[PDB]
Design an enzyme around this catalytic site. Structure first.
Site, PDB file in Angstrom:
ATOM      1  N   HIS B  41       0.850  -1.222   0.000  1.00 53.41           N
ATOM      2  CA  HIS B  41       0.000   0.000   0.000  1.00 53.41           C
ATOM      3  C   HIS B  41       0.878   1.262   0.000  1.00 53.41           C
ATOM      4  CE1 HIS B  41       0.539   1.207   4.109  1.00 53.41           C
ATOM      5  NE2 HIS B  41      -0.145   0.196   4.652  1.00 53.41           N
ATOM      6  N   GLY B 143       2.899   6.741   9.384  1.00 55.81           N
ATOM      7  CA  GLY B 143       4.339   6.637   9.110  1.00 55.81           C
ATOM      8  C   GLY B 143       4.927   5.346   9.658  1.00 55.81           C
ATOM      9  N   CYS B 145       3.748   2.185   9.292  1.00 55.09           N
ATOM     10  CA  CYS B 145       3.557   0.996   8.440  1.00 55.09           C
ATOM     11  C   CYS B 145       4.947   0.479   8.025  1.00 55.09           C
ATOM     12  CB  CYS B 145       2.632   1.289   7.262  1.00 55.09           C
ATOM     13  SG  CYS B 145       0.917   1.515   7.829  1.00 55.09           S
TER      14      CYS B 145
HETATM   15  C1  LIG Z   1       0.780   3.294   8.190  1.00 56.09           C
HETATM   16  C2  LIG Z   1       1.443   4.172   7.136  1.00 56.09           C
HETATM   17  O1  LIG Z   1       2.534   4.622   7.491  1.00 56.09           O
HETATM   18  N1  LIG Z   1       0.982   4.329   5.884  1.00 56.09           N
HETATM   19  C3  LIG Z   1      -0.356   4.773   5.464  1.00 56.09           C
HETATM   20  C4  LIG Z   1      -1.425   4.440   6.498  1.00 56.09           C
HETATM   21  C5  LIG Z   1      -0.378   6.252   5.099  1.00 56.09           C
HETATM   22  C6  LIG Z   1       0.344   7.157   5.840  1.00 56.09           C
HETATM   23  C7  LIG Z   1       0.336   8.532   5.545  1.00 56.09           C
HETATM   24  C8  LIG Z   1      -0.390   9.000   4.501  1.00 56.09           C
HETATM   25  C9  LIG Z   1      -1.154   8.125   3.695  1.00 56.09           C
HETATM   26  C10 LIG Z   1      -1.909   8.616   2.602  1.00 56.09           C
HETATM   27  C11 LIG Z   1      -2.639   7.776   1.827  1.00 56.09           C
HETATM   28  C12 LIG Z   1      -2.659   6.401   2.098  1.00 56.09           C
HETATM   29  C13 LIG Z   1      -1.947   5.893   3.144  1.00 56.09           C
HETATM   30  C14 LIG Z   1      -1.159   6.728   3.985  1.00 56.09           C
END
Ligand SMILES: *CC(=O)N[C@@H](C)c1cccc2ccccc12
Ligand SMILES: *CC(=O)N[C@@H](C)c1cccc2ccccc12
Lengths: 304, 304
Positions: B41, B143, B145
């Site tokens: 993702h 941040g 993930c």
């Molecule tokens: C958990 C992570 O660090 N990633 C995902 C949830 C994430 C973080 C920051 C902005 C964003 C924008 C669009 C999709 C996912 C994210």
């Protein structure tokens, strides 16, 4: 979201842990630059520990009696001195993994990470607080002496604790890295009772803020209080007095949540008087006091 | 003495954490040998996250769209593939700090350490369990993930978890390092409700043994029970059924304490029916289920 009892990443400290052997006693040392720091009681027989005269015992010890091993490599000891209750072993090699560091003496209520070690090898890391009675509630088996407590500010390790003693009640006592005990404790196997282990009120409040930030809000009530009213209740419950200095420190969490510090005091007051009624806050059934306001901000903001 | 919620020393994992950026999304990667593992993702816009077609989205991505930074040094991406819900970024440099490692898929009730990271930099380490509903109760901000869960056996890191998702209820979901979600969860921003978070009975029992070993004995009673009788009570309290396999696993703690497993079940049965009556066990007012029998042995014996 979510809120955990979190230790600092231990890698920078793992790189500093060594094994110190004097005669048949093995415990842990901290190797920073060309000095290995360890409890002076490394020189004691269990007979010695009942009433040790450390200066007299040290006369019988030479540099070559202190065996220092870093991994499976021996370090050469070129000097030794006693500073309060720690030995400083000068070695001929600077620790190549020495991080930026400071020695700090913490206050009661301050939290830190412990790297539990045996034979100079790390076994685990956990988060502690200096209790108001200057004990810590640790996890320390025989061989764990010389394990250290630390905080990290980005890349600077502040060392605040070295493990020395377990009291008969199974709570822990130790020194800063200048070898001065926290509290009235001594490195002697004698009658040493801890004082009242009071709850660190400013830490509970910080953690209630953490709870609100993470969606646990059931305990928020319609009341406020004053520092004097709250303190009457605190005293009755063996909580530390809350000072205006504590209120000032909680200001950023107040601001972020929009809950006045004295309103959160009134919530804490009702929790003390009413109990939890079988409910939990951040997965705890008691009020947690081993998060500082700084810890709550750090973890809720994600500092590295 | 003393018993703490203890994480593995994190140093070996700290040496593996990198930053992965795809467009305007930055999260964490795990660098082992010449492969960087991260949540797929990383390629999604928040619009994409509502109903992502990962194969279609990946077609628009080249090696040079994946920015991998290890400290303040860029790694060259020479290949990329999707394995289930993880991306594998082949880099031209083997991680020089790669520890001995394995990828393992854990079972519910198994515990592990999380190294919470932001921008490839470690912020903290804490101990988790795979819940019976295949969630974990973590501490993960935006941040975080790509942060990983691990166990260590002496010098071999077993990686078991990579952080992907927070559910609307603020519990966490993620994958093993082959990119397969624990439980029924998906890397899509949709309605995903967790099942019943049952208590890990074998873990509570282990922790009651830990309590006895560390002098907390007030809950020991005069009764015994059978697995079938105990399980009737367990079911009523949303505890996992106890199996003979669990009894077998608790044998060493049984042996060490001389308390028959079924006697400790009968103690646990009375604690469920009667509550704690305002008492604590190892400083907890609820029955702790995030220590495995193996954890209790490890910490009570001092493995490194
Ligand atoms: C958990 C992570 O660090 N990633 C995902 C949830 C994430 C973080 C920051 C902005 C964003 C924008 C669009 C999709 C996912 C994210
Ligand atoms: C804490 C520690 O590692 N050192 C002390 C308590 C110790 C350990 C093992 C044996 C022994 C014998 C005599 C005095 C002290 C010790």
């Amino acid at each position: 979201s979510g809120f955990r009892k979190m230790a600092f990443p231990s890698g920078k400290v793992e790189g500093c842990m060594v094994q110190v052997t004097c005669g048949t006693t093995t415990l842990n040392g901290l190797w920073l630059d060309d000095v290995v720091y360890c409890p002076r009681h490394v020189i004691c027989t269990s007979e010695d520990m009942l009433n040790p005269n450390y200066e007299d015992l040290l006369i019988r010890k030479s540099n070559h009696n202190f065996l220092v091993q870093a991994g499976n490599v021996q370090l050469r000891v070129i000097g030794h001195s006693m500073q309060n209750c720690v030995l400083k072993l000068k070695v001929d090699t600077a620790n190549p993994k020495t991080p930026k560091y400071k020695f700090v003496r913490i206050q009661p209520g301050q939290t830190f990470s412990v790297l539990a070690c045996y034979n100079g090898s790390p076994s685990g890391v956990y988060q502690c607080a200096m209790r108001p009675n200057f004990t810590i509630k640790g996890s320390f088996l025989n061989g764990s002496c010389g394990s250290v407590g630390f905080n990290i500010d980005y890349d600077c390790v502040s060392f605040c604790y070295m493990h020395h003693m377990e009291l008969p009640t199974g709570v822990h006592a130790g020194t800063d890295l200048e070898g001065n005990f926290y509290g009235p404790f001594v490195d002697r196997q004698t009658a040493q009772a801890a004082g009242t282990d009071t709850t660190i009120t400013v830490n509970v409040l910080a953690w209630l803020y953490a709870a609100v930030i993470n969606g646990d809000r059931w305990f928020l009530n319609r009341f406020t209080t004053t520092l004097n009213d709250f303190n009457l209740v605190a005293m009755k419950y063996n909580y530390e007095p809350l000072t205006q200095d504590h209120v000032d420190i909680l200001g950023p969490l107040s601001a972020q949540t929009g809950i006045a510090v004295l309103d959160m005091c009134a919530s804490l007051k009702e929790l003390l008087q009413n109990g939890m009624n079988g409910r939990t806050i951040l997965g705890s059934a008691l009020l947690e006091d081993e998060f500082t306001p700084f810890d709550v901000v750090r973890q809720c903001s994600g500092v590295t």
